Structure formats: C-alpha cells, structure tokens
Design a protein around this nucleic acid. Structure first.
Lengths: 49, 105, 43, 76, 155
RNA sequence: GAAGCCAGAGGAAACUCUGGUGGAGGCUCGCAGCGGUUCUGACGUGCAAAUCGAUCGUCAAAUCUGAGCAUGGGGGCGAAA
RNA sequence: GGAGACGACGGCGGGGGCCCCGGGCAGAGUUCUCUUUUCUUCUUAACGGUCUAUCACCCUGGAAACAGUUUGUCUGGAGAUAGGGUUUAAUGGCCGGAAGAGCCCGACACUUCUGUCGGGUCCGGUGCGCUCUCGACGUCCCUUGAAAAUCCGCGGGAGGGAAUAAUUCUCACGCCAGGUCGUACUCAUAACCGCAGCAGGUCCCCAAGGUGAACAGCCUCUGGUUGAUAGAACAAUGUAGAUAAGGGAAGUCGGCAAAAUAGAUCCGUAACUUCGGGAAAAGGAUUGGCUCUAAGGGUUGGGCACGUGCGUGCGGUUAACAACCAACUUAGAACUGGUACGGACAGGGGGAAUCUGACUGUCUAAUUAAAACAUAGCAUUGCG
C-alpha cells in the first residue's frame, strides 16, 4: 500500500542512525588499532624483512 | 537555573578619587532593566561591592557584558569621564576602567 | 561631531595631552598632585 | 592532501622511502591530534583523539623519519 | 613635504581606500622619510598612520518602516504606485493556492481520510477553481463525507 | 490577453454561456541603447569643418553592435536618395 | 557509435554568491533626555575522499467506479498507480587541505634593528528579492539554428600469454622531462581618433542600501574626486529658470510657446470595424497619519495481539486535534491633522472630422523622414 509521511520520515531516521553507527564503529576500530599499534609496527617490519 | 558573574574593576580611578563606586552602584541599580523595565531587579540580578573599587554582579537571566559596558560608558558620559576613561574587557566577564594613553607635552 | 560625512576617530588612537587631562580633572575637583599623573604620562 | 584512517597503512606510508618529514599538530579546542607525513605526491594526515597513547605513536613511527611539533605561529 | 606616495602605500598596506588613510600631521617629516612598505607598516604599528572608520549608514529607519508595514501602516491607496498585479501577481497567488490544495489532497489520500476516486474528483475541482482556499476545501470534504455517511445509513 | 487546458450550467449530440488557467503577437506604455521630430532654442572666427539643451520616434524585432572575411571606379554597393 | 557540437523566447524548481532578520564575544560611536542602543570582524580556495541529490532505467504486479499528475494536460495493457532498487548530474553536508592561514581584540617591549605573548574567530532564520549556473517542461519557424583538431567506448579476434612460474594488468605508489614570445601603464571631459590635455566618437565584465512596479527620478555606503582662470559689483540688453490681479486666444499667417492632464483603486465607456480592435475612449468617485479587525500558510505527531527498534495480522478516518514555526499581500472599521495627502520626484490633455499611405520597417552622414522606397498579397513573361 501507499506509505505515509511518518513512515518515510522513520525510514530516513533509520538511514541516518545507520550512518552514525557505522561512523562510530569506524572510530572505535581506529582506536583499537591505535591500542595495538606496536604489534602492527612489528608485523610491518617483519613483512618488509 | 544558570548564573553569571560580572566584574567591573575601577580600582585606579577609585583610588584616584575620580570614579565614585557607590554612585556607580546606585546608577546601575536604577538603570539595569529586566523585561524592558527598570526597577525590576528582584532576585534576578544582584549588585554588590567586593572592595578595592570593584562592582560585582550576579545575573540569573541573559544579562550581557556588552550591556554592562554600555551602562558604564553612559555613567562615564554623565560624569564627564568619557573622553578620559576607557572600559576594556580584560577577561571573560571582567571589564576594567583605565586611563587612555597620555603624552607628556 | 560630523557624523553625516565622516566617522569620529576613536579615542584609543589619539594620545590625550597631559595638560588637558590635568586641566579637566582639576576643574572636576581632583587633586592631581596627590595621585601623580606625571609618572603615568608616557613620553 | 589525503586522510588516512588505518594505522597500519599510516605506518607503511611513514616507512616508505619518499617520506620526507612528519609533523604533529595539536588542536586542544577540538581535543584532537593530527599526524601529517610529507611524501612525494601527497601529504597524508591521520586524525586521532588526543591521548597519551596517541602521543606514544611517535615511538612506533620510524626513527629516521624526522618528526616536528607544529608551533603556534607559522612564522615566515 | 609631499606625501602622495606615502598615502598610496598606506592605503595599500591597510587594505582600504586612500580616503580612509589618516597621516599624523605633527610628524610629516617622519612619515616623509618612509619610502618602503616596511617603513609604512612600522608607522602603522607605531600609530602614526591609522585607518579611519567607515561612515555611518544606519538601517534603523528602514527597520522601523518594516515593522510599520508589517503591522499594516503605509499601505493605502495614496501609497500604492504600481498596479495590483505589479505589487502581487495573480499567477503567483494561483500557483500558491494550487500547491496548497494539492498538498492537502495528497496528505488526505496518504492518511486515508479520502479515497482515490474522491481524490481525483477533488483534484479536478481544485484545478477547475471550485475552492478558494484550504478551509473551503476542508469544508467541502466534510460535506462530502457527511453525504456519503447519510447514503450509507440510508442503504 | 491568441491558441491549448480545467470546472460549472445547459444542449439528443454538434455546440452555447459563465468563472478560472495559460502566456501568443514583425501588439502596446516605458529605462538603457539605437535614431533624429520640433523649438522665431543655445552656439554661428563654436567645446564641435554638424556640437549642446529640452522635446520626440523605436525599444524583443526588417532591434543594436565588435572582430575576421568578400565586393574596387568604364567598377562596387544601394528597402532607389 | 558517442563526445567536441551548438537557435531564440516564456514561466517553474534546485545550488553558489549578494541583499535582509535574530542571538552571542570583542571593539568603536551616541548619551540634555531616550535608546539592553547604532555600526564594524566572525572567512575557508584549487585538489581529493565519503554520504547524498530532478530526468531516466530495472524488478514484482496487471489498472474503468479509469488512475497518476504540472503554475502550465500530459503519461499509462507498447504496462500506469503502488512497493522496492540502479544510475547521469554538486557551485549540497562532513572530512583531508586547515588554522599553522587570514581577520578582530588586548598586554608588554621598542634609538633603530625589531617584535613578543595572550584571547576569539560562534549559533541560527527568511524570500514572487538581485545575479550567475544547472534541470525538467513549453512556444515559434515556407527561419530548424558551424566545421576540424582531439578523446573515449564497442564490434571483431589477429597476435601474445602460466607453474624453469608467467604477465603485452586503462589499479596504487615510486623515477625522469616540459623550449619560444607577450606580461609595466592608460582605455579616456589629459595616455586612442578627431591638427590639441577638443563638452564629439570609440567593443565588453563585476553592480550595494532607501522610496518606488522598476539597473526611472531623488538621497545614502564602499571606492573615487573636489579638476575644469580668479576677485568685486548687481545698470541696460541677453541666455536659463519662475510668478503674476481681472478677462481667457480679443494675440499671431497659424494656440508657436507656455499652462492644463498624468501614478494607483473603483464606477463607467459611443460611433465605426477587417469582429482582432477602438479603449487608458469619453465622463465620474477616492488616495495622509494613527489604532485595530479579518482573510490568505509550513513542519511534526495515531490504537492493539504476538515475534522482537522493526515485521506481520488486525482495527479508524472528528488529527474536523495538539505542539512548534513563518512572510508578504488584500479587504473592512474607528480615531485624527489639513490651504496641500501619487504633498518632492515621477508622470496620457481630451474630443469631432477630412486628406493621405494598409500596418511594423527603410533613405537623402552635414538644409527636405514624407503621399518617397520596401513589405505581404495579386497579375504577366521566359526557361525541361
């Protein structure tokens, strides 16, 4: 059936919440890599070796 | 309920007996208006002296330091001190009265 | 005031003469010798 | 100018031979820290929240790459 | 002592017109010794050259007239100079009214107050200039609903 | 305010009437621009070997205009004076 | 095969910039009185990443009780509505650039050399506004509104290619190179032409505020000027601008010139006509200020039972209700000053006829702009 303006606005809010959640997850992943920075540097040096 | 503290420092002209702190307090009491009307301070705005030629203001409304500077300049113009005293913001919410730059002739 | 044609130069950009400040405060009734405006005046 | 979001890729960029220099910009109002590396084609920027281990990333960056703190005034 | 070059350099340094440059008349010799933009910047920093502030153009009377016209003053036949269409176009009025009516009809059809056939019929009435405004359209919709309810109760 | 379109009232229909919408025209008032009607105009060894003022024509096009290029005297070009 | 690569005009929608409104920090001005006041700075490039933005296209499904839909009536069994997607298109949001810049304010130092150090650079709103740009429509044509260099995709399958590993990968990063000439300044009441520093002429881009329909006239901001021989006096006659009692064209070849009319709302408008016009015909009523009233809008938001913020299966059209937000027009009324009310500016005199050319248009640069010329229409002649 034909959806209403409230349903369309709810879908738009869902999309905005999804984008914000993805951005927050990306920031947390970057923070976790910053936590495990030394292991990453050792792995990169081993790969170059 | 939020509060804001404002300081009007006039220590140098007050010690020089040029600026009258009590007269300035009376002028502020009779001129600061709340909701577009003077004589409507109540518990919203409190004006006191903390000594050393300073006037201290508690405001619970959105009273602005630009309005306080405007009233200070009005008082200086009434006291014929506008051409010789200057109101300068020195900190967040602190306005100091001081002499303009003087050249020795 | 000539605000129709030009703006007034700000007071902070003009150095006030010591003699004129002396005269104005003296008519206002301030004993300037007790406060020492001579030391406050720059050169 | 390019922004790097991966710590591993930033470490490889800093270990690249064309990395001329690196600089650290501290923004206390935003409470962030930026690591900028100058390569041949691009300047790469890694943006981090200002933190002690964020400062400690300097010891993970290569020693031969010079690292300078950005001063408050860009004097000519 | 000629200071045309110094006034030009001071205007270029201060980023203003030459009519906004003030040169100190009591140190015309010190200003005349300045032949470079570096010396001009030095005199600006020392205060011998300043930028005069702009001339006043207040908007207070325009704002007062705007509030007066908003509350309804100065709108009389002695005040009008253009034609009625020149002041407010009938095409713009029609376009606004049609957009309002079609927006309300789309909202009602989406909400389910009116059905598809009544929507179509009211759309063509709105295009054919039956309704003068939204209140008129709403009253017509209410009357149609009342007649439909009466017919359903009779049947 | 031309076609085209919407609605209502009629009409067996074709059509008629009414209210809107629409925005056509080598249409029209008029700013700039282009032009040059009139004034016992200014000027008349002038600001000027054709200028100045007011007034006037036209103003969405047979409108105005640049650069490049073409036509050369027994010629060219000419909405033709 | 596509791009390069294309007319004019009309309205509509999106975006940037400008204009406007509100709050905040700082600075400046006003201050007899009033004014929480008036004004100023509050900015973000190329180049990129990321998330999005009309048209259009795809999938399900099969529509009359026809539906969707634009300001403008187009679309749909050649598949519409609805639901779900894919994409052309940024001068949109965020981020990198990039605050370290620029701007604003303050405090010390300072023979000069020279500066040094602090604090901020923020948050919104509105639109028949102006300008540029983009998009979808529409109108007109006996008018249909460039070419080439250059770039890309595809059809095709010749060649070239692997585990001694191969790679002839329009991906990312890395290496190298990019010559010649112009570049100042004026672009005009003094930098060009007119014999000149000549009131003439000479192609364009950007274009603020108020009144107002309006890049009209008038006043103002930024930016520019204050340059065009000066001083004194106020005779005639001039040039330019005005007024004049009573009469009102008696003036003069001739109402030449001047005066009168003029904007807008409303009432009303004849003959004639090619039926399109005439027409703003004619002739009338009104217009200031103040205080009010009324009308014309936008956004958001419905109850259960389960699974678990969505999915269903239901149930209802008084949301005809609440909360929030917003701008300009129109109509009506009271009060009130008056010699004036489109108070300056701006701005049709009108009518009855005749001759004449159909009309729009064009020409005698420097004495004639017209019944002259051209025009559409019509007629004739020649040519296969």
């Amino acid at each position: 059936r034909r959806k209403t303006k409230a349903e369309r606005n709810r879908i738009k809010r869902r999309k905005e919440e999804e984008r914000k959640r993805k951005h927050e997850e990306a920031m947390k992943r970057k923070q976790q890599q910053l936590e495990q920075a030394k292991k990453i540097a050792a792995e990169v040096e081993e790969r170059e070796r | 309920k939020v509060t804001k503290k404002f300081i009007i420092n006039a220590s140098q002209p007050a010690s020089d007996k040029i600026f009258d702190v009590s007269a300035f307090e009376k002028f502020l009491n009779e001129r600061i208006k709340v909701d577009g009307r003077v004589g409507n301070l109540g518990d919203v705005i409190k004006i006191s002296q903390i000594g050393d030629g300073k006037v201290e203001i508690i405001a619970h409304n959105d009273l602005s330091g630009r309005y306080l500077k405007y009233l200070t300049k009005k008082f200086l113009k009434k006291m014929q001190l506008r051409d010789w005293l200057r109101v300068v913001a020195t900190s967040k919410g602190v306005y100091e009265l001081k002499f303009y730059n003087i050249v020795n002739d | 005031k000539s605000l129709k044609n030009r703006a007034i130069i700000p007071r902070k950009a003009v150095k006030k003469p010591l003699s004129q400040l002396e005269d104005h405060l003296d008519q206002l009734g301030v004993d300037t010798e007790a406060i020492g405006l001579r030391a406050r005046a720059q050169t | 100018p390019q922004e790097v979001s991966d710590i591993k890729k930033f470490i490889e960029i800093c270990r690249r031979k064309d990395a001329s220099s690196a600089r650290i910009k501290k923004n206390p109002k935003t409470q962030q820290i930026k690591f900028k590396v100058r390569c041949q084609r691009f300047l790469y920027t890694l943006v981090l929240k200002d933190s002690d281990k964020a400062e400690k990333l300097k010891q993970s960056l290569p020693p031969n790459l010079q690292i300078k703190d950005v001063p408050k005034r860009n004097k000519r | 002592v000629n200071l045309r070059t110094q006034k030009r350099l001071a205007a270029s340094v201060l980023g203003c017109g030459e009519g906004k440059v003030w040169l100190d008349p009591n140190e015309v010799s010190e200003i005349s010794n300045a032949n470079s933009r570096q010396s001009i910047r030095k005199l600006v920093a020392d205060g011998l050259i300043i930028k005069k502030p702009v001339t006043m153009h207040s908007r207070s009377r325009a704002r007062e007239l705007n509030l007066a016209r908003r509350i309804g003053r100065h709108r009389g036949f002695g005040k009008r100079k253009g034609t009625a269409d020149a002041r407010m176009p009938q095409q713009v009025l029609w376009m606004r009214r049609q957009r309002v009516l079609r927006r309300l009809l789309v909202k009602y059809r989406a909400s389910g107050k009116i059905d598809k056939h009544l929507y179509h019929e009211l759309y063509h009435l709105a295009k054919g200039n039956t309704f003068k405004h939204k209140r008129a359209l709403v009253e017509h919709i209410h009357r149609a609903k009342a007649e439909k309810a009466r017919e359903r109760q009779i049947k």
